[PDB]
């Protein structure tokens, strides 16, 4: 369902939804399943590329996020145009050795040629069996 998200950038993201999860409520990532998410966002600039930047920090521990194609052109309709909305998903299988925290902190920013396209940092999620 759609999914509380705090905004980094300047508000282009319109929409987040996190299959499985809902609103602000603790939002459960079981390891070793594939997790699915999809923002809807107004791109704030004419642009050829779109890049996937992820930051991810359990118990305050950076972790590095493996696996994810960090070129969305690979699944965008690139050069994307200022001011048309974009429907973006993504559908990532987290590693079942993934370790589990009651505290975890996601940021996600879309990059293009002139700069963040968005941004938004995700405080719910749960990492369980």
Not at 12 to 26: A, F, L, R, W
Not at 58 to 65: N, S, Y
Request: hydrophobic share 35%; aromatic share 4%; charged share 25%.
């Amino acid at each position: 369902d759609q999914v509380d998200v705090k905004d980094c950038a300047n508000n282009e993201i319109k929409k987040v939804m996190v299959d499985g999860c809902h609103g602000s409520d603790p939002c459960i990532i079981h390891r070793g399943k594939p997790f699915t998410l999809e923002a809807l966002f107004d791109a704030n600039q004419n642009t050829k590329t779109a890049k996937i930047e992820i930051k991810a920090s359990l118990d305050g521990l950076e972790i590095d996020v493996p696996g994810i194609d960090t070129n969305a052109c690979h699944f965008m309709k690139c050069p994307l145009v200022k001011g048309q909305q974009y429907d973006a998903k993504y559908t990532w299988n987290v590693p079942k050795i993934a370790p589990k925290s009651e505290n975890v902190v996601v940021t996600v920013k879309l990059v293009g040629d002139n700069g963040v396209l968005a941004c938004a940092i995700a405080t719910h999620a749960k990492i369980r069996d």
